[PDB]
Paper text:
The [name] DNA binding domain linked to a linker region (named [name]-DBD, residues 1-93) with a C-terminus hexahistidine tag was purified using affinity chromatography and size exclusion chromatography. The crystal structure of [name]-DBD was determined at 1.76 Å resolution and refined to R-work and R-free values of 17.3 and 21.8%, respectively. The asymmetric unit contained a dimer of [name]-DBD’s. Three α-helices (α1 [Leu9-Arg21], α2 [Phe24-Gly32], and α3 [Pro35-Asp50]) constitute the DNA binding region, followed by a winged region (WR) (Val51-Thr64) and a long linker helix (LH) (α4 [Asn65-Arg93]). Hydrophobic residues in the α1 - α3 helices (α1 [Ala11, Leu12, Val14, Met15, and Ile18], α2 [Phe24, Ala27, and Leu31], and α3 [Met42, Leu45, and Leu49]) form a strong hydrophobic core of the DBD. Residues in the LH of one monomer interact with those of the other monomer mainly by hydrophobic interactions. In the dimer, two charged residues Arg73 and Asp87 in one LH interact with Asp87 and Arg73 of the other LH, respectively, stabilizing an anti-parallel orientation of LH’s. In the [name]-DBD:DNA complex model, [name]-DBD interacts with the major groove of the target DNA. Positive residues (Arg33, Lys44, Arg56, and Arg60) of [name]-DBD interact with negative-charged phosphate groups in nucleotides.
Two conserved domains in LTTRs, the N-terminal DNA binding domain (DBD) and the C-terminal effector binding domain (EBD) are connected by a single linker helix (LH). [name], which is an LTTR family member, has been exploited for the detection of explosives such as soil-buried landmines. The [name] transcription factor responds to dinitrophenol ([name]) and its metabolic products.
Author numbering:
A (entry chain B): 5 to 57, 60 to 95
B (entry chain A): 2 to 57, 60 to 99
Write the structure that this text describes.
């Protein structure tokens, strides 16, 4: 869909690094790749997620940012757990 | 927060293969050609260095099954977050 783990990762990196350009540096992509992801999410959910000026998240943007970090942690834990089992097989 | 091989879409492919019983029927459900589902599965195997399906009917490996089952928990939480975000947007009378 447009809510992807990558979109949540983009949102997390923009919050942490402060801007599209700094977040794109972290993720190793060109900035337009990050804005494209965010445009598709904003258009699907039909809401503004943040305003750049550092970056300020909207109320809906902050809920996706904060609850999305819980999902990212769970995805990393699942990845870790599956690889650990795989080494035993 | 940066293990990027696993996607929710790959988990949804996994769920459809389990529910429908074959790559062919799952691909039919998802509106894709069956080899597109094979590619998504095999690219994840290669990125994670795991094997998801038994190589001796379509059967998940023990590793594939842990991703399938615990991945459904992730899918439910992603749907819940989508619903909650949409509900907040409505109470705020979001712009279209
Ligand atoms: Cl947070």
């Amino acid at each position: 869909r447009a809510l992807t783990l990558e979109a949540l990762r983009v949102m997390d990196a923009i919050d942490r690094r402060g801007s599209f350009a700094a977040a794109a540096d972290e993720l190793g992509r060109v900035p337009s790749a990050l804005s494209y992801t965010m445009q598709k999410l904003e258009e699907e959910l039909d809401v503004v997620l943040f305003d750049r000026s550092r970056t300020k998240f909207t109320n809906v943007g902050r809920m996706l940012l904060e609850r999305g970090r819980v999902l990212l942690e769970a995805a990393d834990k699942l990845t870790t757990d599956a690889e650990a089992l795989a080494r035993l097989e």
